[PDB]
Amino acid sequence: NSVSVDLPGSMKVLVSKSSNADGKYDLIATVDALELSGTSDKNNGSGVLEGVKADASKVKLTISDDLGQTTLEVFKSDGSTLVSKKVTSKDKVLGDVKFNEKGEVSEKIITRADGTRLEYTGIKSDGSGKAKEVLKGYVLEGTLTAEKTTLVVKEGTVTLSKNISKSGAVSVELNDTDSSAATKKTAAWNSGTSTLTITVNSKKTKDLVFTSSNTITVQQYDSNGTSLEGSAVEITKLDEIKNALK
Numbered sequence: 001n002s003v004s005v006d007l008p009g010s011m012k013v014l015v016s017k018s019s020n021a022d023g024k025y026d027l028i029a030t031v032d033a034l035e036l037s038g039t040s041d042k043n044n045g046s047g048v049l050e051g052v053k054a055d056a057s058k059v060k061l062t063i064s065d066d067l068g069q070t071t072l073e074v075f076k077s078d079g080s081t082l083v084s085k086k087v088t089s090k091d092k093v094l095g096d097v098k099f100n101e102k103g104e105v106s107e108k109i110i111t112r113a114d115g116t117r118l119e120y121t122g123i124k125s126d127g128s129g130k131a132k133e134v135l136k137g138y139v140l141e142g143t144l145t146a147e148k149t150t151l152v153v154k155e156g157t158v159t160l161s162k163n164i165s166k167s168g169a170v171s172v173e174l175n176d177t178d179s180s181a182a183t184k185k186t187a188a189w190n191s192g193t194s195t196l197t198i199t200v201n202s203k204k205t206k207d208l209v210f211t212s213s214n215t216i217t218v219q220q221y222d223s224n225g226t227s228l229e230g231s232a233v234e235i236t237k238l239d240e241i242k243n244a245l246k
Contacts, residue, residue, distance in 0.1 A: 002026075005045035007063065008070055008088035015043045029061055031072060036061050057083060076103075116214040118164070120144050133162075135214055138238035153238070155245035158185055162210070170210060172196040174245075185245070198244075199225070206244060207232075218244045 040047030068090030127146035203225035
């Protein structure tokens with residue numbers, strides 16, 4: 001009579017085995033406690049379903065066949081003022097948006113495939129806000145502007161900035177207010193190798209690699225910067241990152 005299709009999270013959409021006389025399928029989905037009903041032109045789990053909460057909130061679940069993306073929208077009773085929006089990509093990246101009482105965006109958390117998070121709070125009408133990145137073993141603090149996310153690690157006169165553009169590209173910069181030409185750090189970034197090379201008085205001192213695993217590794221150069229030494233050490237603690245900036 002019907003068959004189940006599993007979706008990101010608990011969500012399981014039950015689709016009818018065959019279409020109705022107008023060529024459309026019946027969909028029933030369970031999302032936590034809510035029962036949603038809707039339709040689709042296919043029986044692969046795509047479609048649009050709607051329901052109502054116990055407090056009269058309106059809910060809409062959209063499963064798109066072009067992106068594999070699922071969008072869960074919770075509205076006020078008018079079915080138009082947003083209360084929350086949950087989007088899960090094919091890549092299992094989760095974006096969870098909260099809205100103020102006027103239905104405008106005020107917070108967004110992105111949860112990555114591996115479980116690390118970008119957290120945007122105090123979002124303002126201009127797209128700025130506060131930003132935090134939650135990694136394995138430590139948390140980075142920074143700011144959001146419409147242009148980019150900037151997470152900062154400070155150590156004395158040195159500021160390490162990790163920038164994330166709207167599209168998700170990463171650039172890393174180092175800024176040192178040290179006035180001594182013998183100790184001031186500068187740095188060069190390569191996005192293809194995801195490596196920041198730190199230089200002190202014309203000598204390369206370390207490479208910081210920002211890995212696909214959302215980790216940071218550090219590897220030392222020799223005393224006159226003429227070759228890498230040893231092997232890269234994966235950073236597990238914020239104290240280790242700051243130490244590399246000394």
